[PDB]
Amino acid sequence: IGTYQEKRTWFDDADDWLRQDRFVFVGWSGLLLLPCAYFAVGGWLTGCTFVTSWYTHGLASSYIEGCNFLTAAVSTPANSLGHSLLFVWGPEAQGDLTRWFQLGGLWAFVALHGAFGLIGFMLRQFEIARSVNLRPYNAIAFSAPIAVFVSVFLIYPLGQSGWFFAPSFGVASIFRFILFFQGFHNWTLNPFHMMGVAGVLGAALLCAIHGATVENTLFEDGDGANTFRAFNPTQAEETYSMVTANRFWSQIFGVAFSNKRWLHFFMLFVPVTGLWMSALGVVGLALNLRAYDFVSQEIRAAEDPEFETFYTKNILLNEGIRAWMAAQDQPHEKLTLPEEVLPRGNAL
Amino acid sequence: IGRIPLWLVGTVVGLLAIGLLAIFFYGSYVGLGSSL
Amino acid sequence: IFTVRWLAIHAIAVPTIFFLGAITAMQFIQR
Amino acid sequence: ENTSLWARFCEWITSTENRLYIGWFGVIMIPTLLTAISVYIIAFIAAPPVDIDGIREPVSGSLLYGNNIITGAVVPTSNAIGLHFYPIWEAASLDEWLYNGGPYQLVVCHFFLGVCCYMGREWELSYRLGMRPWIAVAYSAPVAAATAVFIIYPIGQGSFSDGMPLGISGTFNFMIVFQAEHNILMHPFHMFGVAGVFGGSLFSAMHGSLVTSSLIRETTENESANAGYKFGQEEETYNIVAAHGYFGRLIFQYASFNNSRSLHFFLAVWPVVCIWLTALGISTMAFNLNGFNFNQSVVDSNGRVLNTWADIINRANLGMEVMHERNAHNFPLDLA
Amino acid sequence: ERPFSDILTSIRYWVIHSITVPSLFIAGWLFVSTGLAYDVFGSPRPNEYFTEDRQDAPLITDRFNALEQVKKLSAQ
Amino acid sequence: KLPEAYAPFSPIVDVLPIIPVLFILLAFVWQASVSFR
Amino acid sequence: GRDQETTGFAWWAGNARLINLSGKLLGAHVAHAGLIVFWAGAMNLFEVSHFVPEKPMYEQGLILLPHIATLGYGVGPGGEVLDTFPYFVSGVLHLISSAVLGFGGVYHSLIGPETLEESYPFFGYVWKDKNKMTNILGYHLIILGCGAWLLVLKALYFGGVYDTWAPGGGDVRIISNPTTNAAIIFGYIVKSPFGGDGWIVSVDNLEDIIGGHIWIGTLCILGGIWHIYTTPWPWARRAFVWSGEAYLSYSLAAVSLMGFTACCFAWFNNTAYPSEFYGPTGPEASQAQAFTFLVRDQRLGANVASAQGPTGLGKYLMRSPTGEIIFGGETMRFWDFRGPWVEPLRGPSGLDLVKLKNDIQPWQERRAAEYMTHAPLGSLNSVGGVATEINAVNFVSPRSWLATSHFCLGFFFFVGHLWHAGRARAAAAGFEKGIDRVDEPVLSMRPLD
Amino acid sequence: MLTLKIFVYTVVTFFVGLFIFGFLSNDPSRNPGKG
Amino acid sequence: LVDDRMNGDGTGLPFGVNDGILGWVIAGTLGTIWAIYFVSQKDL
Ligand code: CLA
Ligand code: CLA
Ligand code: CLA
Ligand code: CLA
Ligand code: CLA
Ligand SMILES: CC1=C(/C=C/C(C)=C/C=C/C(C)=C/C=C/C=C(C)/C=C/C=C(C)/C=C/C2=C(C)CCCC2(C)C)C(C)(C)CCC1
Ligand SMILES: CC1=C(/C=C/C(C)=C/C=CC(/C)=C/C=C/C=C(C)/C=C/C=C(C)/C=C/C2=C(C)CCCC2(C)C)C(C)(C)CCC1
Ligand SMILES: CC1=C(/C=C/C(C)=C/C=CC(/C)=C/C=C/C=C(C)/C=C/C=C(C)/C=C/C2=C(C)CCCC2(C)C)C(C)(C)CCC1
Ligand SMILES: [Cl-]
Ligand SMILES: [Cl-]
Ligand SMILES: [Fe+2]
Ligand code: NA
């Protein structure tokens, strides 16, 4: 490199064989990404098929006990296991693979392999962008799935009592995680979650509205009723009228884009910043640092037996969730609550 | 080398796939996890 | 054979057909 | 010939030279939307407490009654009215019009007409500008969702008191009560909808990053990269084929969009069709078709029920259910 | 170059796969038909989620002797 | 249940509803067979 | 058929290739009508194969057998099924008819003439011949008018129709003297669709139903003759679009309207959709639960006129906002329900206390209890009850299924109307393919947007 | 109170009639394109 | 009665018209808009 001799070494040979264009690009990140990602996805497919959640949660959570696609999950370890890494060789499994599946070790397997697979995938984006000589804005846009995954699947259970409170990899298990955050953390009320929701909704809006605008401002290049064949990707001319689009959205909405680079950076910026602020909120909830209560309104409702709002209704709904969910969701607490102390409404 | 049609291959594969999901939706009502 | 394409296809295809067989088998396991 | 009074008014209305296009759908969209905006602002500021439940207890809902921006909400019409049309002129006075939930039903009717004519006005401006006309179709998905939550769910449930309250914590209340009653989380249409917003965000990040990653060098390091684009230029401002090559060797060489019009069609159609499916999910659950019910599906050889994740979801649902309408039930079944 | 239009249209492809794909499928068939999945991954059979000693869902409630606690809460 | 004459024809009654879905799938089969021209 | 090169339409828009091919278009339509008749017959035979007589029809997942039974086939007093043979007859007749229609569609699609104007000028049309298009429209209005008069004849002279308002609990009735008053008939049409009025969903007697059918059959026949003998006026020419896609978009808007109104009919109406066949309506189930618990708490020695609820507003009886006596609880929202087991108990002041006390009937109370246990709340696994219930009742109401699916179809067809109205307008305008790139209208306008 | 209903009926009828006759006033001819 | 209402809820009135002045003003407004639309014709 740089008018220097640079005698060919084993590193440069392996780099030449790895950074080549083929069916699937391996690179150096493929030394990490392909095994970690393959093991994480295969472990989830194995756990949703054969691995039970009977000894960690007292639930049936695989296709072998009769569960469908939505209810099977790779479930978190027992809360008594805390934040143990659940090695197959460690103090708990002690080398026995079968007892390692039953102990909740497959969740730790899938979580660690998935996290390092996410690292490998971002590094893969980095090396492909460097090889093609393109900017790594795809990696920067992928930084938000990694922030969300780390904050929810590692930072949050690390802040809580153990991996048991991490989300279990499944459909209904994720729904359970969401409902638990509603009942216990009041995660809707948190402004960081609100910024995340606004980011996702605005990004879906941006996706739909950008696609529709581009395809309803297309130039002709036609002689045929199908427009997809009016595009030939080796051309130095735009396909759609940015001027027509700007005029249309200016007179419909009041404001409209006039810079494509700013438009596409905005399409990057809205969901990424939304997921980053949502991840910051989940990190706040990891410590039970919550946006649960409005003290002034709550004092006002306490001192006025006639003042209810949808906020106080949500607080009562949350308490109902907690008391009716705790006994079967947190079995380590042995909550043998009698049915007379469970809070309910009338009749029903 | 291009003897069997790709469309015939794909149609057979799609039949096998729809048969698999149909067996899956059939056995949601019998056997394990059927609630009877 | 044994190309990178063959490895990448097979690492998913072989366990896919194996687990599909398992799910079809235990799909007829009755209570 | 352009002399007549209807000619002057008509060419003013269809004029593309106005700062905001009005048009024939605009002659309805503008007055309905200003009506809904005026009533919504005045009600959010100082609406007296509204009896949502029909049981002689009101929910305050307005800032002047001690609510902050997160809590404040235009509270739906009373349960006693049901789907009955309740205009101001039908009520005895403005005060009891307010107490029975008049501002909500007014704002929701005007918002329906406003979004429908906003869609028509979108089509109209595209027609007047020589455009293709399907931005109205793409906008029909948030309109579908708005109708589903403000009118279609009240028609299915029998009262505007089940509509979404016009507020933040009121919206959260609507979501929690709705999941309690219908299990939206386990409804496939809501699964498609969630996949729609997650995909809309995913492909929004993907499209933005691939275009920003391929912008052709035109400016210096000390200037905004946006300054490399001038409005009205005809050159392609990014390397589409290079972004294709990057995307192909990143995911799949052959399963990558080699057509920019194909990419933008997927961008337009994916969240739009998914929001169509989730709006129809809300409509299906208006007529009580509900989500997937897997409560006590899995049983052992003895017939003893094994709890599952869907059963923990159900326990959370019972918690949500036994708190919505804490005093409005006289009967055990929630058939209302 | 084998662009998937030649492989998926090749009788050579379909003669070395008409045995391997059904072979793996029937291998998966017998893997859970003969209970090897139950042996390997430790998922319980329908008659063995509960013993006489305990009539409730298991609780590991331990960390360092959790191996023998799963050994005693499982089905022997 | 079908009338006493048509009782053994109940199995071929039982498959007849799905035929229009088979028709749209057949349109796609034909388009695949003509190479999606 | 054609390809992308010869037409400009891709395979996923292939039917557009046959917009201007009259014979192939006719073949596609006839084959499609064969599919609709085929589904009607095949599903009718499937239902009568899976029908069970000791259960009511709303418990077996039936959507066509209730439709046949409302015409007065195989059912007698009480809505009880007496013969599945008329249903069998309808199913097999439709299946044979679909064979004939399918042959016609396949023939005209495959080897029929490509365009009909060069050989059969009577059926030959182009989308701009407004005279010919109104002739076709007129023929179809006479056809639909004969369908409506066929129903009128069925109600008048061919066994009548099932009347759920007949005394005793519903029975097939010969309709005599249907209402012909235009005020009564079109008051339904110009009625508000809100609560208590419900537009034309609140039609509540077969007298109004059959009279409106007499009315609509005569208008359809008259308008058909008018359309055969006229051409659209210049205002109609200046306002409408005259492409086949435009006619399609008009039809799409109209049938989306029909789908939405069909959803509301199935959900609310109980005289064209009797509850004996379709299950109770939404209001019917809640009012039924209130009514049952009212009579049980009369049998357990308690006064229901008194005994206010936990909010002090009344456990069993209360006042509607308009002043009458209604059932207490959340079912007050359904206070405008009207059914065959509440009207004999309703006085001028709403529910009458002495009539509720003494003039009860056993058939009304068992109908109410059965409607209470079979409310239109279920999951899409067909798991009856609210989302918090157990997998123990395999039941979802046909009213739920019909209203659900037809709202979905009505909405998607409104969206299709949007798509086609836009594409027809832009195709008549000339920029259905995009902007000219040299004569772009936006560059010719003033600055500042 | 009836007065407000009369005035609102006038408003809605006026705007709906404006919409109706605005679209009746040769709207498909207000395209910018050729023909 | 403790107050006065238009008590027009329900009863299915044509276009919600409870006094004929509403129908006459609907007729008048549509009629005068049709009148201006008709006198301003033979244009474009
Ligand atoms: C992309 C490669 C990769 C990566 C990054 C990981 C990463 C991880 N794996 Mg893993 N794994 C992989 C591939 C990979 N794996 C493959 C291919 C297999 C199949 C065999 C497995 C099977 C596997 C199992 C069964 C388990 C893991 C587990 C783990 C986690 C903890 C492992 C650990 O702590 O030991 C780390 C190991 C090292 C750091 C190796 C260091 C070697 C040094 C550099 C050499 C020095 C040794 C030398 C001989 C010392 C002698 C001294 C003498 C010379 C003087 C971790 C996140 C555990 C887990 O999932 O937890 C739940 C677990 O039980 N993996
Ligand atoms: C209701 C569904 C329907 C119907 C009635 C039609 C009808 C038609 N299509 Mg079409 N199509 C459909 C759906 C449908 N399509 C869908 C969903 C797609 C998207 C995949 C397409 C995409 C498409 C394209 C791209 C094209 C058509 C074309 C055509 C026309 C001629 C076909 C032809 O002759 O080529 C030959 C077809 C065959 C030789 C297949 C024969 C199979 C037969 C018809 C099936 C019926 C057999 C039946 C079981 C036996 C009953 C007989 C008796 C016992 C009753 C025809 C009128 C072509 C056209 O526009 O014409 C100019 C054309 O280019 N279609
Ligand atoms: C739209 C009208 C309609 C309605 C209201 C019904 C209603 C009903 N049907 Mg029926 N059916 C219909 C049309 C209809 N059907 C058609 C067109 C067919 C031919 C395929 C059938 C064939 C049929 C059979 C064979 C049976 C029924 C049965 C039933 C009953 C139970 C339904 C059930 O639980 O299934 C489950 C519900 C679903 C499967 C809903 C699916 C959701 C949608 C449709 C699919 C998802 C779309 C996807 C997300 C979007 C992709 C877009 C694009 C990529 C394609 C119920 C009353 C059963 C019965 O009770 O018999 C008496 C029964 O055995 N139906
Ligand atoms: C569904 C069948 C059908 C269809 C598709 C058409 C279609 C058409 N008719 Mg027609 N007509 C029909 C049935 C039908 N008609 C019947 C059954 C009759 C007998 C009563 C007539 C009598 C008739 C006459 C006298 C005329 C037409 C005319 C026309 C043409 C222009 C109409 C127009 O401007 O649109 C829409 C019309 C309007 C927007 C203004 C109409 C005023 C309202 C909408 C009528 C309904 C009143 C009601 C209170 C409105 C609210 C109803 C709502 C709440 C449901 C058009 C092609 C005209 C023509 O061009 O002559 C050739 C014309 O002169 N028709
Ligand atoms: C009587 C109604 C009707 C008729 C005659 C037409 C006719 C036509 N349409 Mg159209 N359309 C309609 C309704 C109708 N449409 C509706 C309701 C929608 C929904 C918004 C659309 C959306 C639409 C689009 C986007 C396009 C057309 C196009 C076309 C033209 C070519 C169609 C073709 O070959 O596509 C091929 C057929 C297929 C690809 C098969 C479609 C497969 C669908 C998606 C599966 C749906 C099944 C699923 C179970 C539905 C469940 C939904 C829910 C209820 C559960 C043709 C003239 C094209 C066009 O404009 O050409 C000029 C085109 O671009 N249509
Ligand atoms: C054009 C075309 C097409 C087609 C379409 C269609 C639609 C067709 C059709 C057709 C049809 C629509 C047909 C039908 C038929 C029918 C038949 C063939 C029948 C029959 C009969 C029988 C044999 C029966 C019997 C019975 C009885 C009588 C009773 C008892 C039971 C039983 C079943 C035994 C497609 C899309 C593909 C593609 C494109 C082209
Ligand atoms: C999606 C797609 C595809 C496809 C797939 C598939 C797989 C399909 C299918 C399909 C199918 C699967 C079809 C079938 C068919 C059939 C038909 C259509 C028929 C018929 C017939 C009839 C009509 C009947 C009749 C009768 C009666 C009526 C009675 C008795 C007698 C008899 C039986 C005769 C592919 C991948 C390629 C490509 C891409 C796209
Ligand atoms: C059977 C029956 C009945 C009867 C019924 C009836 C008689 C009906 C009718 C009705 C009618 C009689 C209707 C009418 C209508 C109309 C419509 C629905 C329309 C439309 C359209 C449109 C939307 C338009 C648009 C436009 C304008 C604005 C102007 C011109 C141009 C254009 C196109 C732009 C009753 C219920 C009694 C009972 C039950 C059964
Ligand atoms: Cl609540
Ligand atoms: Cl209640
Ligand atoms: Fe772009
Ligand atoms: Na309660």
- With the most atoms of ligand 2 within 8 angstroms of its CB, the residue from G5, G6, G7, G18 to mutate is G18
Every domain of chain A and the residues it spans: 1-348
Residues of B with Cβ-Cβ distance to D299 under 8 angstroms: 35
Touching, C vs G (3+ Cβ pairs under 8 A): no
Helices (H), E1-76: 11-15, 20-33, 36-41, 66-73
Q: Contacts of residue H10 in chain I, CB cutoff 8 Å?
A: 25, 29
Rg of chain F over CA atoms, in angstroms?
Answer: 16
Q: Chains with 3 or more CB pairs closer than 8 angstroms to A?
A: B, C, D, E, G
Answer whether D270's CB lies under 8 Å from D179's CB: no
What DSSP element (H or E) covers I23? helix I20-39
Residue D183 CA: distances (Å) to CA of D273, D281, G143: 22, 11, 46
- Number of A–E residue contacts, CB under 8 Å: 84
Say if residue C5 carries a ligand binding annotation.
yes
SS (H, E, C) chain G: CCCHHHHCCCHHHHHHHHCCCHHHHHHHHHHHHHHHHHHHHHHHHHHHHHCCCCCCHHHCCCCCHHHHHHCCCCECHHHCECCCHHHHHHHHHHHHHHHHHHHHHHHHHHCCCCCCCCCCCCCCCCCCCHHHHHHHHHHHHHHHHHHHHHHHHHHHHCCCEEECCCCCCCEEECCCCCCCCHHHHHHHHCCCCCCCCCCCCCCCCHHHHHHHHHHHHHHHHHHHHHHHCCCCCHHHHHHCCCCHHHHHHHHHHHHHHHHHHHHHHHHHCCCCCCHHHHCCCHHHHHHHHHHHHHHHHHHCCCCCCCCCCCCCCCCCEEECCCCCEEECCHHHHHCCCCCCCCHHHEECCEECHHHHHHCCCHHHHHHHHHHHHCCCCECCCCCECCCCCCCCCCCCCHHHHHHHHHHHHHHHHHHHHHHHHHHHHHHHHCCCCCECCCCCHHHHCCCCC
The answer to whether residues G265 and G272 touch, using CB atoms and an 8 Å cutoff, is yes
The protein residue with its alpha carbon nearest to ligand 1, atom 13, reads: A35
**Other chains touching F, judged by 3 or more CB pairs under 8 Å:** B, G
> Strand pairing partners for A74?
A169
CA-closest residue to ligand 8 atom 30? H24
Ligand 2 site-directed mutation target among G30, G35, G109, G110, most atoms within 8 Å of CB: G109
Place of tokens 């009580």: D288
How many Cβ atoms from other residues are within 10 Å of residue F15's Cβ?
11
What b/e sequence results for G298-317 when a residue is b if at least 16 CB atoms lie within 10 Å of its CB, and e otherwise?
A: eeeeeebeeeebebebbbbb
Structure tokens at D159: 């009262």
Closest chain D residue to the Cα of B29, Cα to Cα: D297
**Given resolution (angstroms):** 3.6
Cα separations in angstroms, D177 against A321, D168, G334: 12, 14, 20
DSSP label of A49: T
Q: Do chains E and H touch (3 or more CB pairs under 8 A)?
A: no
- Residues G192, G197, G203, G205: what is their CA dihedral angle, to the nearest 10 degrees? -150
Domain span at E48: 4-73
Contacts of A188 (CB under 8 A, 6+ apart): A182, A194, A314, D172, D175
* CB-ligand 1 contact for A311 (6 Å cutoff): no
Closest CA to G58 of G401, G364, G444: G401
The domain of I23 spans 1-44
Residues 271-310 of D with CB under 8 A from A: 271-272, 275, 292, 294, 297-299, 306-310
Tokens of G226: 């008018």
User: Which run of H or of E encompasses D73?
Assistant: strand D73-74
Spatial CB neighbours of H27, under 8 Å, sequence gap ≥ 6: D14, D24, G239
**C10 among the known binding-site residues?**
yes
D88 vs H: CB within 8 A: yes
Q: Name the token pair of D34.
A: 């200003």
Q: Which residues of G92-114 are buried (b: 16+ CB within 10 A; e: fewer)?
A: eebbebbeebbebbeebbeebbe
CA dist list (Å): G242 to D4, D127, G73: 28, 17, 44
Q: Do the chains contact at B11 and F35, CB–CB below 8 Å?
A: no
Are G35 and G255 spatial neighbours (Cβ–Cβ below 8 Å)? Answer: no
Query: Minimal Cα–Cα distance from G237 to chain H, Å?
Result: 9
Burial class (CB in 10 A: 0-12, 13-18, 19+), G159: middle
Tell me how many domains chain E contains: 1
Nearest CA in chain E to B32: E46
- Tell me the CA–centroid distance for residue F19 and ligand 7, in Å: 7
Instruction: Decide: residue G446, CB within 10 A, 0-12 exposed, 13-18 middle, 19+ buried.
Output: exposed
| Closest residue on chain B to E10 (Cα) | B1
Q: Please, is D61 exposed, middle or buried when counting C-beta atoms within 10 Å of its C-beta (0-12, 13-18, 19+)?
A: buried
Ligand 6 mean position, distance from CA F37 (Å): 27
| D21's tokens | 């296009």
DSSP per position, A213-249? HHHHSBB---SSS-SGGG--SS-SS-SB-HHHHHHHH
| G361 within 8 A of G306, measured Cβ to Cβ | no
Which residues, 6+ apart, have CB-to-CB distance to G205 below 8 Å? Answer: G165, G271
List the single residue in E4, E46, E57 with the smallest CB-CB distance to D301: E46
Helix (H, G, I), strand (E, B) or coil at D249: helix
Instruction: Report yes or no: D110 and D8 within 8 Å, Cβ to Cβ.
Output: no
* G443 and A CB contact within 8 Å: yes
* Residue G169 CA, ligand 9 centroid: distance in Å: 39
CA angle, G10 as apex, D252 and D247 as ends, to 5°? 15
Question: Smallest Cβ distance to A103: which of E38, E61, E66?
Answer: E66
Distance E62 CA to ligand 1 centre (A): 26
Residue with tokens 């809300």: D282
Q: How would you classify residue G178: left for phi > 0, otherwise alpha for psi between -120 and 50, otherwise beta? A: beta
Method in brief: cryo-EM
Contact between D246 and A126 under an 8 Å Cβ cutoff? The reply is: no
- Token representation of residue D32: 């309905």
Token reading at I15? 């276009």
Instruction: Determine contact, residues A319/D316, Cβ cutoff 8 Å.
Output: no
Category of B31 on φ-ψ map: left (φ > 0), alpha (ψ -120 to 50) or beta: left
- Structural domain that includes position D61: 5-186
Q: Which residues line ligand 3 (CB under 6 A)?
A: D 192, 277; F 17-18, 20-21; G 39, 47, 50, 61-63, 380, 382, 398, 401-402, 405
D277 CA: nearest ligand 3 atom = 49
Mutate which of G70, G201, G216, G261 to test ligand 8's pocket (most atoms within 8 Å of Cβ)? G216
Residue type, A160: Q
Q: For residue D28, which amino acid is it? A: I
- Decide: helix, strand or coil at residue A250: helix
Instruction: Confirm if F23 and G35 have CB atoms less than 8 A apart.
Output: yes
Q: How many CB pairs under 8 A join D and G?
A: 223
Query: Which chains pack against C, by 3+ Cβ pairs within 8 A?
Result: A, B, D, E
Helix (H, G, I), strand (E, B) or coil at A156: helix
Closest atom of ligand 7 to CA, residue F12: 30
Instruction: Report the run of H or E that residue D74 belongs to, with start and end.
Output: strand D73-74
Contact present, E and F (at least 3 Cβ pairs less than 8 Å):
no
Q: Is G416 in the pocket of ligand 5 (CB under 6 A)?
A: yes
Contact A274, A202 (CB under 8 A): yes
Question: How far lies G133's CA from each of G121, G129, G242, G246, in Å?
Answer: 13, 6, 10, 12
Smallest-distance ligand from the CA of F28: 2
Beta bridge pairs of residue A240: A218
CATH number at residue E9: 1.20.5.860
User: Using a 6 Å CB cutoff, which residues line ligand 2?
Assistant: F 24, 27-28, 30-31; G 1-2, 11, 14-15, 17-18, 21, 24, 27-28, 31-32, 99, 102-103, 106, 109-110
Number of domains into which chain I is organized? 1
Q: How many other β-carbons are positioned within 10 Å of the β-carbon of residue G241?
A: 18
D70: which 2 tokens?
Answer: 């997160």
Decide if D1 and I43 are in contact by the 8 Å CB cutoff: yes
Name the helix (H) or strand (E) containing D166: strand D166-167
Chain F residues inside the 8 Å CB shell of G84: 1, 3
3-state secondary structure of A259: coil
- The whole-angstrom distance between residue A211's C-alpha and the CA centroid of its chain comes to 24
Residues D6, H33: C-beta atoms closer than 8 Å? no
| C-alpha atoms less than 13 angstroms from C-alpha of D47 in its C-beta half-sphere | 35
Judge whether A172 and A300 are in contact, CB under 8 Å: no
Q: Identify the CATH number of the domain in which residue D62 sits.
A: 1.20.85.10
Q: Do D328 and G311 touch (CB under 8 A)?
A: yes
Among G17, G36, G48, the residue to mutate for chain F (most F Cβ within 10 A): G48
Q: Which residues of A127-140 are buried (b: 16+ CB within 10 A; e: fewer)?
A: bbbebbebebbbbb
Would you call D331 and G419 a contact, using CB atoms and an 8 Å cutoff? no
What is the distance, to the nearest Å, from the Cα of residue G252 to the centroid of all Cα atoms in its chain?
Answer: 15
C-beta atoms of I6 and H9 within 8 A: no
Q: Which of D164, A80, A146, F17 is nearest to G48 (CA)?
A: F17
Beta partners for residue G163, in sequence order: G171
3-class DSSP state of A169: strand
SS3 A284: helix
What sections of A137-286 are H helices per DSSP?
137-150, 156-159, 171-180, 191-216, 242-253, 260-285
Q: Is A280 exposed, middle or buried (0-12, 13-18, 19+ CB in 10 A)?
A: middle
HEC string of D2-47 equals: CCCHHHHHHHHHCCCCCCCCCHHHHHHHHHHHHHHHHHHHHHHHHC
Q: How far is the CA of F37 from the centre of ligand 2 (A)?
A: 14
d(CA G266, CA G201): 9
Q: Which residues of G touch I16 (CB under 8 A)?
A: 192
Pairing of strands G346-347, G350-351: antiparallel
Task: Residue A263: name the closest of A198, A200, A211 by CA.
Answer: A211
Q: Which tokens belong to A194?
A: 């609100």
